[PDB]
């Protein structure tokens, strides 16, 4: 989720979670305009100042994860599995091979066709199981009459 | 049942998105309007059972069940961009360039801030916004004013009858905030301070990161109809998709209860 | 509601005022001691999507 | 979610910004010392689908995004204004004016006027940096090829020099940040300005009584408008057909 | 359920085809862009039963369709005049070389160059052109001939001074290049080892100054393909609907 | 499926399968502009070459 917000004191955040870059939780100047480079460098320009005063103020930390070694958590933040964590260290290293772009925001990835087919299959399987339940109950109920004398 | 609650939350989220889109489209003609955008967030996750041991001379899938909960609208952020300027030829209309907010005085005693440049003079000569609320610096224009002129800065002067040199009457200073996104928006094109946005600081235009004043121009709303139409189509399709889940859950529950 | 429309409005207004000053100059061509006028325009503000 | 809607939306946005810059270029065709603008686009990120020396890999695009907009700093035409205080730069260079706040702004549109104090100011109130002062009781003002400005007085034969018009040059002309009133300010993309007398170190000359006009090609602009209109309509059709397909899917 | 899976695969294939069609349509005004077309293929075939004159009486069930590749039509686009003095266009084959920030080298095709504050030649976006042509100050005029030589004139100079040469690279098979975003391509195993050459030699192209190469996108072709994709999608949805009807009736009875 | 492709070394491969003609499967130069005739002849022209 690339939607980054700025607090009153220049603290960056994402949904209330402070984003950490190279170092600790990065804090930009108080009320400066912020620009993101193509590889994670953060530039700040104090408003009203001449444009030749834009200065780098920090750098984001971007990690690369394959996808088959990351598990979701209760809050909704992916973390490494135990084996991948042991193999690659407790905390990942900011690889320089990842490049990003500003001005765009990525949405979700849910396939409507997959959702519809899954729903149809679930409904049909539920109906078949219900029919099986009915048949078994009827058979047992009629079989218990044998116990009489 | 959990499916109905989850689909109810989804339908509510889509309805709220449609509501903010409709609000954005409705006031496309309001002066100095900043378009909003609603951002959602998924709820917590319930873990029925945690994954066990894996990756032991095998290529098995992880056996971890983790159900979702739904979606809630977490925020509605406005885009404090710069809108276009339209000419009105009225000497009492001021357009603002950059950042800043004119400070008006609410009747109860507090103060609110606005960007809508549309000023009129009441019966006492005071400068008030369209609606009767007085401008906090309270610029007073005397009678028999041949022409009221406001420069690129906040200085305002008016020429008299005989005297050649115009007589200055006031300064239109404007306030700025550390984070303009956190302002609380109410009716009458008014923004008020919150805990999220820092304490306002006043400055004359052109200094301390403030804007500049253009006379006789009005800033228009920065709404994007191309974005709005596609958002409408997307939310309609998503609403239909979500309703399909309710329909299927109802059908399967009906088949169950016909047991 | 479109930036192109709100820019072409100002363009039309500028051309209209230029034609108006030309017509005013042409009107009183026989006036004794009259000095002709010419108009000078400037561009409006700019929106910076990405800081140069 | 649907694949093509957010691609067609980006296409519509790109065409909208293209039409915006075209309209901006057309609007100021009568202003002096203006430079036409061109926007340049680029594709967005691509997603690679992973497959089991293959000829190629499966890659899917995402859309288009306007990346930059440059100004064509060519030489415009010259129109004879018949005035005596209008200067047109032949070549490359910029006058240095000073904003009221104190900073410096560099412009090319030369149409000067004299304020009540006798100084030389541009149209708008800003005064030129070298602080050219024209004394009262002036018969005529002459500006040569160089920056020397001379004023002729009654009863004197030799004209008296009052100031010098040194004009600045930049290493990167396009990188200047443009604000209103045909003013530019220096940035990091543009080099540090360096002063120069006219005719030396690549600086241009000066013509008195002329104003440089804008280099806008209306013939190109009209065809660009036709192209952007057609592109916008095609993208709208793409949106419509995506909507139809998705509606047919969801009404299952 | 077999019908459901097959129809799901068909719908996904049509979705990807519509995606690439929309991608081609979107950047119709992007300099140095090449259209893409997607090619599909069938999956494995199940052999349920092995085989005077009668029909062979054999069963062989299909599985579905998958997308295999997206080939780019590396044709020649038209040239449009921008009247600028620092823009170049490729006539024929060949790609420029630029340096990414990390250190690797990526190739581009379009020509739209600015000059940074130092004086070096960079593309629109900050990426520095690999041959590193530097244009000093007081550059009255810049010339980039049909060959890679770049010559700048100065004040009161009888002859222009050369400030470098713009050699360009060529690939054995350009269709296999990986296309990362922002009008860039990076070498991969599919394409052969690139070889650089001066323009006009070893099959390379020629440089025209003041023109840019427009994308070769065929709008009529894309519209017809889009109509066909929509109709095929509508046809495929009927398979899911009929399978659903069959399953519902089976469950009911 | 008449969708032929050229690998880096110059082998006409369809869907990863080399094409077979008479006298050896196939062999083409590094980057020649292949032109396939009406009945099977495969003319090759080296780019840049006259």
From Swiss-Prot, chain B:
PROSITE patterns cross-referenced by the UniProt entry: FLAGELLA_BB_ROD (PS00588)
Alphabetical UniProt keywords: Bacterial flagellum
Keyword Cell membrane attributed: no
Compartments in which it is found: Bacterial flagellum basal body
Signal peptide boundaries: none
Pfam families: Flg_bb_rod (PF00460), Flg_bbr_C (PF06429), LlgE_F_G_D1 (PF22692)
GO cellular component, one term: bacterial-type flagellum
Gene Ontology biological process terms in this record: bacterial-type flagellum-dependent swarming motility
PANTHER family documented for this protein: FLAGELLAR BASAL-BODY ROD PROTEIN FLGG, FLAGELLAR PROTEIN
Summary of subunit composition and partner proteins: The basal body constitutes a major portion of the flagellar organelle and consists of four rings (L,P,S, and M) mounted on a central rod. The rod consists of about 26 subunits of FlgG in the distal portion, and FlgB, FlgC and FlgF are thought to build up the proximal portion of the rod with about 6 subunits each.
Sequence similarity: Belongs to the flagella basal body rod proteins family.
Xref: NCBIfam families: FlgEFG_subfam, flgG_G_neg
Protein name: Flagellar basal-body rod protein FlgG
From Swiss-Prot, chain F:
Source organism, top-level taxon: Bacteria
Transmembrane segments: none
Subcellular location: Bacterial flagellum basal body
Quaternary data: The basal body constitutes a major portion of the flagellar organelle and consists of five rings (E,L,P,S, and M) mounted on a central rod. The rod consists of about 26 subunits of FlgG in the distal portion, and FlgB, FlgC and FlgF are thought to build up the proximal portion of the rod with about 6 subunits each.
Entry's family note: Belongs to the flagella basal body rod proteins family.
Protein name: Flagellar basal-body rod protein FlgF
Species of the source: Salmonella typhimurium (strain LT2 / SGSC1412 / ATCC 700720)
Gene: flgF
Residues of the full protein shown: 102 to 151 of 251
């Amino acid at each position: 989720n690339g939607n980054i917000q700025v607090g009153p004191t220049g603290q960056l955040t994402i949904q209330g979670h402070p984003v950490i870059g190279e170092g600790g939780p990065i804090t930009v100047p108080e009320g400066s305009e912020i620009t993101i480079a193509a590889d994670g460098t953060i530039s700040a320009l104090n408003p009203g100042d001449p444009p030749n005063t834009v200065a780098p103020v920090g750098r984001l930390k971007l990690v690369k994860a394959e996808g088959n070694e990351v598990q979701r958590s209760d809050d909704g933040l992916f973390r490494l599995t135990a084996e991948a964590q042991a193999e690659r260290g407790a905390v990942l290293a900011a690889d320089p091979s990842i490049r990003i772009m500003s001005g765009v925001l990525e949405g979700s990835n849910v396939k409507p066709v997959e959702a519809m087919t899954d729903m149809i299959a679930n409904a049909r399987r539920f109906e078949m199981q219900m029919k099986v339940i009915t048949s078994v109950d009827e058979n047992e109920g009629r079989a218990n009459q044998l116990l009489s004398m | 049942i959990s499916s109905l609650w989850i689909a109810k939350t989804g339908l509510d989220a889509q309805q709220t998105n449609m509501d903010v889109i409709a609000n954005n489209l409705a006031n496309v003609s309001t002066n100095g309007f900043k378009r909003q955008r609603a951002v959602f967030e998924d709820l917590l996750y319930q873990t029925i059972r945690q994954p066990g041991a894996q990756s032991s001379e095998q290529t098995t899938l992880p056996s971890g069940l983790q159900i979702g909960t739904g979606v809630r609208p977490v925020a509605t952020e406005r885009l404090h961009s710069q809108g276009n300027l339209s000419q009105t030829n009225n000497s009492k209309d001021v357009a603002i360039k950059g950042q800043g907010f004119f400070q008006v005085m609410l009747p109860d005693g507090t103060s609110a801030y606005t960007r809508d440049g549309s000023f009129q003079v009441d019966q006492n000569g005071q400068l008030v916004t369209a609606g009767g609320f007085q401008v906090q610096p309270a610029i007073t224009i005397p009678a028999n004013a041949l022409s009221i002129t406001i420069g690129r800065d906040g200085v305002v002067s008016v020429t008299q009858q005989g005297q050649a040199a115009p007589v200055q009457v006031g300064q239109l200073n404007l306030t700025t905030f550390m984070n303009d996104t956190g302002l609380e928006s109410i009716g009458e094109n008014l923004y008020i301070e919150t805990q999220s946005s820092g304490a306002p600081n006043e400055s004359t235009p052109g200094l301390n990161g403030a804007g500049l004043l253009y006379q006789g121009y009005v800033e228009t709303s920065n709404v994007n109809v191309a974005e709005e139409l596609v958002n409408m189509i997307q939310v309609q399709r998503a609403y239909e998709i979500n309703s399909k889940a309710v329909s299927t859950t109802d059908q399967m529950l009906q088949k169950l209860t016909q047991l | 509601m479109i930036s192109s429309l709100w820019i072409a409005k100002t363009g039309l207004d500028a051309q209209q005022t230029n034609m108006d000053v030309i017509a005013n100059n042409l009107a009183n061509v026989s006036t004794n001691g009259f000095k002709r006028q010419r108009a000078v325009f400037e561009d409006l503000l700019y929106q910076t999507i990405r800081q140069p």
